[PDB]
């Protein structure tokens, strides 16, 4: 059994993203397949159940229209296709495995969860993407680092020395800020004899802009 | 009505201990109970299925069972390696649909406290440049975590939007947090001396850096 | 030649269970399990009549 599939790119409020992940090794003919999302702090939310055989699918309670579905018996693979994204939708996505089958409202409660395995990020977002337009950041046993700001979407890699050091490279968790930004913070340690005599630089990689800026710290004049 | 979970556990190491999930009638008993665990950034896994048949993929270690309106998940001992979250689940003919517990914390049980160092990072006048001024401090070599980063101008504290980021467990056995404030250059330049303080629970300290060099 | 439909929980003694499953409470409806491992004798009939 295997659930491989791609991460979810992140969508504007108002908008619709696709979650679907492949099925291999079995038949899709049998396993009525269900969709979750893992709320922070808290439990998890149904919305309905999925038949591969014939169009009889049903919705809870609280999900009438925010959740659509259709199926695929070429591919085996269910396509998801939300609408009216809010802020309660910041969970992960994982397909989950039903055993067995169920159709009428009274055989449900045998069937247990079978498999789980590499779900789908999904986070709606005030700003859908933005390229980084971050400036180095001057230092203070020393002590000395590079900030990023203005960018989107979580995270960025910050390596120094051309990845060459990784002793206290820590990656300090951002924050949800009011504008949408986040800070990735991520320093080093320096013996206080050097700190302006070598020059450092840290490298910043960004996935949906393609922009690496290599940006050199210097002492605040 | 929703499946409640206490927040989280506190058993030792050595001893057994157990976890309540409190219900209804409807809910439970007359419906199975199903118990999800899920790895820190990875996938869940049902851990007892019908509160009687074991999975096939884990060795005879735990026990489930459900008792009314309740149903208990034993565990007989505890490792220090492996501090993984249950979830209670259950089925509904009112909802007619699949509820979800809380989920609770299990942690081992003490450790004397860390001396924990500040530094404060001012931005160079690149930043400074394009009409903008952020200031960051970082705490780190902490232990344990759960500190409060406040910031001060040595005779008054500020409050533009003052953010503080949750502790983070790193890999040698430490927690870190940092703190980012942002404002306007003619702000930034009305004081001369900035600081942030952090609360270790009976440690606190200053790191006073002049916004000169 | 009558049909009766029930969800509450049967008693086969003096346990009162108003929802609870004790060990003289059990459920009265049980499920099959209908698979191509089975054999001609564990396997569905539509049996119309």
Request: net charge neutral; glycine share 8%.
């Amino acid at each position: 059994v295997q659930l491989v599939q791609s991460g979810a790119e992140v969508k504007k409020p108002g908008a619709s993203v696709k979650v679907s992940c492949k099925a291999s090794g079995y038949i899709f003919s049998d396993y009525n397949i269900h969709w979750v999302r893992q709320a922070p702090g808290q439990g998890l939310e149904w919305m309905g159940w999925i038949s591969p055989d014939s169009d009889d699918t049903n919705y809870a309670q609280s999900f009438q229209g925010r959740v659509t579905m259709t199926r695929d018996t070429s591919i085996t693979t269910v396509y998801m296709e939300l609408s009216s994204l809010r802020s309660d939708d910041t969970a992960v996505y994982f397909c989950a495995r039903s055993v067995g089958y169920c159709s009428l409202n009274s055989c449900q409660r045998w069937m247990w969860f079978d498999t789980w395995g590499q779900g789908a990020l999904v986070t709606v977002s005030s700003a859908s993407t933005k390229g980084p337009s971050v400036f180095p950041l001057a230092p203070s046993t020393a002590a000395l680092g590079c900030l990023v700001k203005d960018y989107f979407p979580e995270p960025v890699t910050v390596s120094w020395n051309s990845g060459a050091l990784t002793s206290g490279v820590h990656t300090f968790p951002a924050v949800l800020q009011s504008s949408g930004l986040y800070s990735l913070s991520s320093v080093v340690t320096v013996p206080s004899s050097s700190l302006g005599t070598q020059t450092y630089i840290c490298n910043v990689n960004h996935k949906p802009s393609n922009t690496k800026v290599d940006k050199k710290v210097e002492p605040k004049s | 009505p929703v499946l409640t979970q206490p927040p989280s556990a506190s058993g030792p190491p050595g001893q057994s201990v157990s976890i309540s999930c409190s219900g209804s009638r409807s809910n439970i008993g007359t419906n199975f109970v199903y118990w999800y665990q899920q790895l820190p950034g990875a996938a869940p896994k049902l851990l007892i299925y019908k509160n009687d048949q074991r999975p096939s993929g884990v060795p005879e270690r735990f026990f489930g069972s459900k008792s009314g309106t309740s149903a208990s998940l034993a565990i007989s001992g505890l490792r220090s390696e492996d501090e993984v979250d249950y979830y209670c689940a259950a089925w509904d003919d009112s909802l007619s649909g699949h509820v979800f517990g809380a989920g609770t914390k299990v942690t081992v049980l003490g450790q004397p406290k860390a001396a924990p160092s500040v530094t404060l990072f001012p931005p160079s006048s690149e930043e400074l440049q394009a009409n903008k001024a952020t200031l960051v401090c970082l705490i780190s070599d902490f232990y344990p975590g759960a500190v409060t980063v406040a910031w001060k101008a040595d005779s008054s504290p500020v409050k533009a939007g003052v953010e503080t980021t949750t502790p983070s467990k790193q890999s040698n056995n430490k927690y870190a947090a940092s703190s980012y404030l942002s404002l306007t250059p003619e702000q930034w330049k009305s004081h001369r001396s900035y600081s942030c303080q952090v609360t270790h629970e009976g440690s606190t300290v200053e790191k006073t850096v002049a916004p000169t060099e | 030649f009558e049909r009766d439909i029930s969800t509450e929980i049967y008693q086969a003694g003096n346990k009162p269970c108003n929802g609870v499953a004790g060990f003289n409470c059990y459920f009265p409806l049980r499920s099959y399990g209908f698979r191509p491992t089975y054999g001609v004798g564990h396997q569905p009939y539509r049996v119309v009549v």
